[PDB]
Design a protein around this ligand. Structure first.
Ligand SMILES: CC(=O)NCCc1c[nH]cn1
Ligand SMILES: [Zn+2]
Length: 313
């Protein structure tokens, strides 16, 4: 439905048409589907891949690492968050986030590559940035006062499921770091985050999302509206009912994740995580062949419209 603040149909269809499903799958997702536990060569290689892909965008993003070493159940480990801010001068930003590490499992099993968890989230952010690159470049050249920020967090997963401090390494570090860095008007980089939208556990068939935070329910309702509209406009696949993903009511459950260090510091959060979790969750079957590609692209389309409406692209 065409609500105030929504895209006119023509601008909606242009935006959706700038997505490239083969690019998402082959250019952004496939290279991530490797073991990428914190400290590993695979993790370093995925980090460098994210950085170089983000630097390649013609919009000219500010891309930096947040490297640090932390104590873990395995001893000291190095972590590195990838922080991409389209216009570092802007007063505030929409922040989209996900984790790029994969969960460590014991040797001797099929390697875990976390296709839903969170390779698909990562690839979605890269595809949105590329598909909207011209518009984002124009917004930045016009000094828009709300920019876009993408966070690819390291170390979300426990290394040994060794208690509550064996988790969220990257997000805990980056939230503390942002609290310590001045920003204008700020007064710190935490207050620059106008909304923190965390994507997690995406790409399985039949996801269900609930609003986890009354504070941000208006954005949850916008996602739901976009799902219904794309359905009606014949722009979703394998989507027989008008609303399938964005469900009303209390969450099936809520869970700790990379938004918590930000939430605790007063950042508004929308947690875009399937609850219940994918069937494959935390098993080595969380792989490419068990993703549901029409759902991946449906989510990409929903998010692209969301982003364009949020930032007036
Ligand atoms: C309580 C809990 O397991 N939260 C973490 C959810 C998760 C796992 N893997 C990715 N995200
Ligand atoms: Zn996980």
């Amino acid at each position: 439905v065409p609500l105030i603040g929504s895209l006119p149909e023509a601008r909606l269809r242009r935006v959706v048409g700038q997505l490239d499903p083969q690019r998402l799958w082959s250019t952004y997702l496939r290279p991530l589907l490797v073991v990428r536990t914190p400290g590993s060569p695979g993790n370093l290689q995925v980090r460098k891949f994210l950085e170089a892909t983000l630097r390649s965008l013609t919009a000219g993003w500010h891309v930096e690492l947040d490297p640090f070493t932390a104590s873990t159940p395995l001893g000291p480990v190095d972590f590195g968050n990838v922080v991409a801010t389209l216009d570092p001068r802007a007063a505030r930003h929409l922040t989209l986030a996900c984790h790029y590490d994969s969960k460590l499992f014991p040797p001797g099993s099929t390697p875990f590559v976390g296709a839903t968890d969170s390779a698909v989230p990562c690839a979605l952010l890269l595809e949105l940035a590329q598909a909207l690159d011209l518009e984002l470049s124009r917004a930045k050249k016009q000094a828009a006062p709300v920019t876009l920020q993408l966070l690819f967090l390291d170390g979300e997963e426990a290394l040994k499921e060794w208690g509550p401090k064996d988790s969220l390494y990257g997000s805990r570090h980056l939230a503390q770091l942002m609290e310590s860095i001045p920003h204008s008007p700020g007064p710190t980089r935490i207050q620059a985050i106008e909304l923190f939208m965390l994507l997690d556990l995406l790409g399985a068939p039949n996801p269900t999302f609930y609003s986890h935070f009354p504070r941000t329910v208006r954005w949850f309702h916008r996602l739901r509206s976009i799902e219904k509209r794309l359905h009606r406009l014949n722009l979703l696949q394998s989507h027989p009912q008008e609303v399938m993903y964005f469900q009303p009511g209390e969450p099936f459950g809520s869970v700790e994740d990379d938004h918590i260090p930000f939430l605790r510091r007063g950042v508004p959060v929308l947690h875009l995580i399937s609850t219940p979790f994918p069937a494959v969750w935390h098993t080595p079957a969380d792989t490419e062949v068990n993703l549901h590609p029409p759902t991946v692209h449906n989510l990409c389309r929903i998010l692209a419209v969301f982003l364009a409406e949020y930032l007036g692209l």
